[PDB]
Amino acid sequence: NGDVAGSLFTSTYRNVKLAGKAPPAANLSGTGSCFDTTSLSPARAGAHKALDVQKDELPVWSKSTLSYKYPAGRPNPTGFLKKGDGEPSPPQAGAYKRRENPPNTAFRRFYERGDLPIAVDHRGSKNMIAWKVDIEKLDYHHYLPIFFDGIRETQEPYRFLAVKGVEDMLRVGGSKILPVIPQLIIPIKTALNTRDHSVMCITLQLLQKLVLSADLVGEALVPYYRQILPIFNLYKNKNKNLGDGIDYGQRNYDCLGELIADTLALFEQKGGDDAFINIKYMVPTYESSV
Amino acid sequence: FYERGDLPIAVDHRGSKNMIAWKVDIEKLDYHHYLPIFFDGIRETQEPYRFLAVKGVEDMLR
Amino acid sequence: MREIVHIQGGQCGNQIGAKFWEVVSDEHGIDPTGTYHGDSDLQLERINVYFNEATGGRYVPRAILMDLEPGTMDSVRSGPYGQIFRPDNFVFGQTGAGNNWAKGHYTEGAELIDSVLDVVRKEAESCDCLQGFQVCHSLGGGTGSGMGTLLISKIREEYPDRMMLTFSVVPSPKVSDTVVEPYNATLSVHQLVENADECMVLDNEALYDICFRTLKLTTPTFGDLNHLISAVMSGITCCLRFPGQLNADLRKLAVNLIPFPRLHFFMVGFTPLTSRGSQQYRALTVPELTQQMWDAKNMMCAADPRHGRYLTASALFRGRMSTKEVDEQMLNVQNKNSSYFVEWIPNNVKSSVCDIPPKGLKMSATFIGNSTAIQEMFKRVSEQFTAMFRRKAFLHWYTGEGMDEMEFTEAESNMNDLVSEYQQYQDASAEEEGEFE
Amino acid sequence: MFKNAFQSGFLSVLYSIGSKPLEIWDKQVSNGHIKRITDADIQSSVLEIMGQNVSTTYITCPADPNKTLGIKLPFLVLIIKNLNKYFSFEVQVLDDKNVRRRFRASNYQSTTRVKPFICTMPMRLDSGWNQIQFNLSDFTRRAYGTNYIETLRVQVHANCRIRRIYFSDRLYSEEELPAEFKLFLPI
Amino acid sequence: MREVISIHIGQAGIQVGNACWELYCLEHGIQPDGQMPSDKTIGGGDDAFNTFFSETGAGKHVPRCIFLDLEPTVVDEVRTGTYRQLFHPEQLISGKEDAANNFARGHYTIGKEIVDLALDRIRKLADNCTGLQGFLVFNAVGGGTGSGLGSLLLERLSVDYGKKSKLGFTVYPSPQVSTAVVEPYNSVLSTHSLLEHTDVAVMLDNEAIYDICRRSLDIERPTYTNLNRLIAQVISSLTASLRFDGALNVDITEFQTNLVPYPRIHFMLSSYAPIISAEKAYHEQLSVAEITNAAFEPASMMVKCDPRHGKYMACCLMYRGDVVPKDVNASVATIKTKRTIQFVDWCPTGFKCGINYQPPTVVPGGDLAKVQRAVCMISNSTAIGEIFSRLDHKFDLMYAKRAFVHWYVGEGMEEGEFSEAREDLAALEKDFEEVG
Ligand SMILES: CC(=O)O[C@H]1C(=O)[C@@]2(C)[C@H]([C@H](OC(=O)c3ccccc3)[C@]3(O)C[C@H](OC(=O)[C@H](O)[C@@H](NC(=O)c4ccccc4)c4ccccc4)C(C)=C1C3(C)C)[C@]1(OC(C)=O)CO[C@@H]1C[C@@H]2O
Ligand SMILES: Nc1nc2c(ncn2[C@@H]2O[C@H](COP(=O)(O)OP(=O)(O)OP(=O)(O)O)[C@@H](O)[C@H]2O)c(=O)[nH]1
Ligand SMILES: Nc1nc2c(ncn2[C@@H]2O[C@H](COP(=O)(O)OP(=O)(O)O)[C@@H](O)[C@H]2O)c(=O)[nH]1
Numbered sequence A: 001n002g003d004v005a006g007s008l009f010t011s012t013y014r015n016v017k018l019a020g021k022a023p024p025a026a027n028l029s030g031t032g033s034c035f036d037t038t039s040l041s042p043a044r045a046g047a048h049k050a051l052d053v054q055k056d057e058l059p060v061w062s063k064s065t066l067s068y069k070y071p072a073g074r075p076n077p078t079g080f081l082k083k084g085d086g087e088p089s090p091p092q093a094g095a096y097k098r099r100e101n102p103p104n105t106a107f108r109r110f111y112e113r114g115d116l117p118i119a120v121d122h123r124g125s126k127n128m129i130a131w132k133v134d135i136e137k138l139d140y141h142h143y144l145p146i147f148f149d150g151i152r153e154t155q156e157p158y159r160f161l162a163v164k165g166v167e168d169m170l171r172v173g174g175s176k177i178l179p180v181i182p183q184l185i186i187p188i189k190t191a192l193n194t195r196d197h198s199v200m201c202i203t204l205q206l207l208q209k210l211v212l213s214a215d216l217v218g219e220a221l222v223p224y225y226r227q228i229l230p231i232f233n234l235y236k237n238k239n240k241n242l243g244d245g246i247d248y249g250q251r252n253y254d255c256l257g258e259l260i261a262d263t264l265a266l267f268e269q270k271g272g273d274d275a276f277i278n279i280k281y282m283v284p285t286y287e288s289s290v
Numbered sequence B: 001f002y003e004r005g006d007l008p009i010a011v012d013h014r015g016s017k018n019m020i021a022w023k024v025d026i027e028k029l030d031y032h033h034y035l036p037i038f039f040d041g042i043r044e045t046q047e048p049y050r051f052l053a054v055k056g057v058e059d060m061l062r
Numbered sequence C: 001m002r003e004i005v006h007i008q009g010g011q012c013g014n015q016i017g018a019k020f021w022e023v024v025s026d027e028h029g030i031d032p033t034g035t036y037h038g039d040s041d042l043q044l045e046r047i048n049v050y051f052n053e054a055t056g057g058r059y060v061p062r063a064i065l066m067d068l069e070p071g072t073m074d075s076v077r078s079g080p081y082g083q084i085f086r087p088d089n090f091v092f093g094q095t096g097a098g099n100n101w102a103k104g105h106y107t108e109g110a111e112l113i114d115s116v117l118d119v120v121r122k123e124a125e126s127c128d129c130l131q132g133f134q135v136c137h138s139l140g141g142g143t144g145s146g147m148g149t150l151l152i153s154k155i156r157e158e159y160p161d162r163m164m165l166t167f168s169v170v171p172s173p174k175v176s177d178t179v180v181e182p183y184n185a186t187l188s189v190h191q192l193v194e195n196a197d198e199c200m201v202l203d204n205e206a207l208y209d210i211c212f213r214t215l216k217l218t219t220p221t222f223g224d225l226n227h228l229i230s231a232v233m234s235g236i237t238c239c240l241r242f243p244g245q246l247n248a249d250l251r252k253l254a255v256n257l258i259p260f261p262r263l264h265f266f267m268v269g270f271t272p273l274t275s276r277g278s279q280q281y282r283a284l285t286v287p288e289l290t291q292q293m294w295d296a297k298n299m300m301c302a303a304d305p306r307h308g309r310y311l312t313a314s315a316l317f318r319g320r321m322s323t324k325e326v327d328e329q330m331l332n333v334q335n336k337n338s339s340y341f342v343e344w345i346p347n348n349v350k351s352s353v354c355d356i357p358p359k360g361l362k363m364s365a366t367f368i369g370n371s372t373a374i375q376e377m378f379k380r381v382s383e384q385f386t387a388m389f390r391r392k393a394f395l396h397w398y399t400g401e402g403m404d405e406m407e408f409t410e411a412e413s414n415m416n417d418l419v420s421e422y423q424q425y426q427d428a429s430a431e432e433e434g435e436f437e
Numbered sequence D: 001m002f003k004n005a006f007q008s009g010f011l012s013v014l015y016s017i018g019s020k021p022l023e024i025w026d027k028q029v030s031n032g033h034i035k036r037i038t039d040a041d042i043q044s045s046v047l048e049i050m051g052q053n054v055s056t057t058y059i060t061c062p063a064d065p066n067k068t069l070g071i072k073l074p075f076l077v078l079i080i081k082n083l084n085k086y087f088s089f090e091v092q093v094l095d096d097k098n099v100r101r102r103f104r105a106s107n108y109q110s111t112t113r114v115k116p117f118i119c120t121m122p123m124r125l126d127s128g129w130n131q132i133q134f135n136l137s138d139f140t141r142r143a144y145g146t147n148y149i150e151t152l153r154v155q156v157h158a159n160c161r162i163r164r165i166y167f168s169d170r171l172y173s174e175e176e177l178p179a180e181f182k183l184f185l186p187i
Numbered sequence E: 001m002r003e004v005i006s007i008h009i010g011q012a013g014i015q016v017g018n019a020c021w022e023l024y025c026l027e028h029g030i031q032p033d034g035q036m037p038s039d040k041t042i043g044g045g046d047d048a049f050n051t052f053f054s055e056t057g058a059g060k061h062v063p064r065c066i067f068l069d070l071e072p073t074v075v076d077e078v079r080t081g082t083y084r085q086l087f088h089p090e091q092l093i094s095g096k097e098d099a100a101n102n103f104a105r106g107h108y109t110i111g112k113e114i115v116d117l118a119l120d121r122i123r124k125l126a127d128n129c130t131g132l133q134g135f136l137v138f139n140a141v142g143g144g145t146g147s148g149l150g151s152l153l154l155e156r157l158s159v160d161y162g163k164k165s166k167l168g169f170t171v172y173p174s175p176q177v178s179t180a181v182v183e184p185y186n187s188v189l190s191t192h193s194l195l196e197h198t199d200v201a202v203m204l205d206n207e208a209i210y211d212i213c214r215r216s217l218d219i220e221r222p223t224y225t226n227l228n229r230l231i232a233q234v235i236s237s238l239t240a241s242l243r244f245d246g247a248l249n250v251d252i253t254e255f256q257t258n259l260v261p262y263p264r265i266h267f268m269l270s271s272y273a274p275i276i277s278a279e280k281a282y283h284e285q286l287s288v289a290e291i292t293n294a295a296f297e298p299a300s301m302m303v304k305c306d307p308r309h310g311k312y313m314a315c316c317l318m319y320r321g322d323v324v325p326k327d328v329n330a331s332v333a334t335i336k337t338k339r340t341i342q343f344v345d346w347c348p349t350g351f352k353c354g355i356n357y358q359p360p361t362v363v364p365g366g367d368l369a370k371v372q373r374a375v376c377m378i379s380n381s382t383a384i385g386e387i388f389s390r391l392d393h394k395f396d397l398m399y400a401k402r403a404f405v406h407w408y409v410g411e412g413m414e415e416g417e418f419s420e421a422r423e424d425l426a427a428l429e430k431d432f433e434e435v436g
């Protein structure tokens, strides 16, 4: 389908400059200049956060009214009576709350140490990749997971480099890609677990490119649906109801509600004769597209 | 039916008087569909409906 | 018809099955000799759901005790109601498990599975119409966790159409009796998710807290803990055993409760519960029962329903009572506390009534609730698991049984997928526009 | 409405290309979405409606009830893409006798069952883009043995991509159709 | 000569089976032994029991009913209750496994293996009849057995007889009170199936009967045993013209023609009057005029529909006891002058009245009182479509996320059968609106 390398910069500029929209607030702790290597934080991304609700704010259950009511107010000496007197929802869970995405990936660390054969190619008519060596002779087992682990990034030029890396390696991969699948599930799941729209819309297009990059990749991926579909089930019904308003935004890929539908159709297309039930098990709303 | 414009009739002012003008050939029409419709307009009194209806049956019976 | 076979795995399960079978034998009025000494034919009409008739007019449980370290098997044989078990239905290993899921599931499991499977088949033939299997575990130790999951995997492929219960005791959030407790819990929840049909979860802390506050006990023992467990395990099958104007088969009790195939971790409590003092004066009415069961205390596990929303709930009453009262009490609770119930379910409680009250009571009621607050237990368990596995402590043991670490990672990922399921369904409204904005 | 108008060769009720295509249509969405996107096969705009629960996401042709779409053209033709999902549409008809029949066609149905006021019937959609033509006057004669007078309401449910809805007054061929009233699928 | 076949399906089907057959055996003096006491014969006429019974070669009267179920735990109770000498054990049918609140199991998985059994019984049960008026199906729309099987049976009955009349006294899911959570599904799945196969379908609800029990009978402790007594009171009043004398007899055929205007509108309401206790019964005259007022009272309905939001397409009045035809004519005429009671313009008529000289019976130890007048009303109102809209909402509410669907599709069903059934409701709703 459409590429993911070019669209990203123009989108970010259109969003931040043209509209009054926010970046919004990408944490850049530990990262200084382009020269000093960052201090990788021990935290992990897409991590479920504990419940912060207080002790007492929890309402108590009244045995007499069958209702959760808030506790009464303890007296206070300042608030004493004077002469005149004539007179609970539960704490919501962060289902759609963007998890914290620290810059402590492995791609950033490897690129900082300078072990990658990539570089930006400004001599092209746009941002392109420039390889120090030949792609089709690389060790995919060592490099391909590293490149997937940089998809979660948001700081330039790391995310551009990472997306363009996987985009170019999947084209020339061929058979060298199939045995690497068991090592790609963790970074894919970690990128999806961030709840952030930018990384999610990127990884879904990369996942499409992944199933299309070679043959027999579909059946090989099928056993791993239980670890990548759980997020699909959330944003499957995040669409825009414009009515008569034509969607100019359709020029680029931003609507998850159908970026997920296309990807699920593609999974059922390539998975074989049993991918449909493994999909229907995770996302129940799905409908067979054959 | 005349309001919806499904009838092949029209008034023929080019004659020396009020005459009928058929868009098609009478002797090949479907009488089962048209002839009762034309009889049902005899009850009319508003022009030109009653003229058209009477002239319709008068020409179809010949 | 509607026969049921019972398993007790691990030390905890083999001990609590003792109390379960004592309570059932008392219900149906039989002596630890195996001889029936009741009064009515109501103790014999549907006795065949749990027992086998023997020569000489005696009744023997349809239970299978499986446990390494046969000290517990000799304990249950010494116990008062031990003489009723077929000694053939006793599968033990001479070695121990050392609280190690790896050897409980991989090495020492594969040596006893053949025997336990021959036993289960020999006695599953004896059933006319087998309803399902029920088992009792303890997710903390090795024997229970590993061998229960191994036998569940075997049973699921040998009898897929049948249905399976698991009355599992879960790790404790504040007490750490064993140190490898989170490993043993996660490596077993990963197996439960695909091969269980109903999974009740019970916790010693909430058991203690109930017994201390409500029952006013001064020194709770595992005896009283298992007394509570057996009360609930018995109240489950009242519709199969005794008549009821509104019966509730075990299968219609799962169909009406689990909406999605993965959300089968329930949460139970028992009513009435009171001390000897207020027993003399508390009137026993459907209102009292339904106002005690809906509390956030009677939940035998340590998950506060205040943090979530009830997907479904169920209340099985027993005793000659007015069903309009039950129906309207459930309706009025749903109406009052409407925010704690999901919206895409119009009415989300089931109410079942049996005519036969307990032996010493006039009315009782058992509660089940598939609340979305259960996700906090898995969150805590995964937190502990990943605080410890991050440093790779106590892993040489689990690797010694041929295991590797991708199994740990897979189990953790599946736990997180299940807590995400729970979170999504905790706030998906009936109308999609409010979720994504 | 559409009374005392002129319908002789064609009558287009809906067209994705325009300043506002849902002029007369009422739209009701519950768990779905309506928009206008550029299709890939037919490289132009198509108005798509989708969503779960087919029976709830639809669009009615007259803006409001108690207002009829008086149209007397026999043939009715839709241009729809087949998304391999549950798609259905309904058309209400006035017979020669003052009785409002209604026929509906569903792709998730397998048997036709004539009823006093309803006639459900299956539809065997093709793959991708296709135009479907209803006689709508043979249907009334074949079902209730009566004559067609004039359509009253049209309604199209979810999981489809509409491009054209038009009454034809006769079965025109691919040649006789004008440029706008045909399927020109480019390369 | 004038015989019917009474089929009871599911739990509530055979629960009221314990109520109807308690009443009929009590109506005709039959003791639970199936014999007559033969020394204190009370039946003023002979050969009236043949409507519901089959005299054997010598002395015994066996009911021509059929108790059907997949749960043994209730059918065995009948085999132990006092009413065990009555039924031929071939009639009591049971299964080893239950449908477990699942239409698919009651329809596709389990039912298809015992229908042959039940149908063979019905053959043997109809062959002894000489004139069969029609079947009388008791169902509980909302369960796996009642909906799954009841649907599966009626098809098998229609293909066999078709020309025979079939009635359905199906209890219906209440708006507020609900003893299940998945009853929206199997209810919808049931209606789409019974519709083309039932000829008439009376409808009543649990919750509405609770209030009739509250206001009138003033009972604080209602139970299914209290309600089932009322259903027996209706059908006794309904079938009286079959097995009793009286002016203006009404057969089943005569009853269905003038009450179903269009081939699908047949869901009808119900109401009984008077319904009182002993002490009130004897400080009162119970005039025919004040009874027929309580009948058309909205509170006395047995379903949670308000008929004052719609219009009456027809009304049938089965009077029972000491009633003279002049008073019916003078009291029905009173209500036509009333303003609250609307009638669609296309029926200047609207009343099919029936009188019986046989007063209603009371069960010793019951809750009703003995009276000399009683009115049971069956009306076909166009407002009934509102209760058909609640399900159109609840079904649509959960079918979005497709909850509990993995069960139905797991037991030999497809998602098509869901939206297939969904149309027939939305198609039915406007059918209730086209008549406006
Ligand atoms: C004289 C009398 O009846 O007194 C009661 C009594 O006062 C109370 C307090 C009982 C009593 O229970 C306790 O004191 C207790 C102590 C520790 C843990 C749990 C309970 C009782 O032991 C419990 C016992 O319950 C039964 O007998 C039930 O049939 C019960 N049976 C057993 O658990 C059982 C135990 C050992 C051997 C055989 C049976 C049962 C519950 C569920 C399912 C089947 C059976 C009864 C009513 C009483 C006493 C004796 C005081 C209570 O227990 C139950 C289960 O009813 C505790 O709160 C309830 C309310 C009872 O009213
Ligand atoms: N009026 C009345 N309603 C009853 C009675 N018993 C049950 N019901 C209602 O019937 C509904 C349940 O129907 P069931 O008959 O139990 O279900 P089923 O058709 O047998 O299918 P399974 O449950 O799988 O056996 C509930 O809503 C009950 O409230 C009764 O005795 N009288
Ligand atoms: N309710 C109850 N819980 C027990 C009992 N005995 C042990 N437990 C718990 O069971 C846990 C130990 O697990 P265990 O079964 O002994 O190890 P395993 O044999 O390898 O499965 C501990 O958390 C104990 O607290 C008992 O008698 N009653």
Ligand SMILES: [Mg+2]
Binding pocket: E010, E011, E101, E143, E144, E145, E146
């Ligand atoms: Mg039932």
